[PDB]
Amino acid sequence: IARTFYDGPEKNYEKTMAILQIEAEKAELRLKELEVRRLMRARGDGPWYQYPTIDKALIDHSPKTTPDN
Q: Which amino acid, 64? A: K
Those residues with Cβ within 8 angstroms of residue 50's Cβ, 6 or more apart along the chain or in another chain: 44
Chain centre to alpha carbon of residue 47: 10
CB of 8: closest distance to ligand PLX in angstroms? Answer: 9
CB of 36: closest distance to ligand PLX in angstroms? Answer: 42
- Window 1-40: contact mask with ligand PLX (x via CB under 6 A): ----x-x---------------------------------
CB of 15: closest distance to ligand PLX in angstroms? Answer: 13
Taking the C-alpha atoms of residue 31 and residue 23, their distance in angstroms, rounded to an integer, is 12
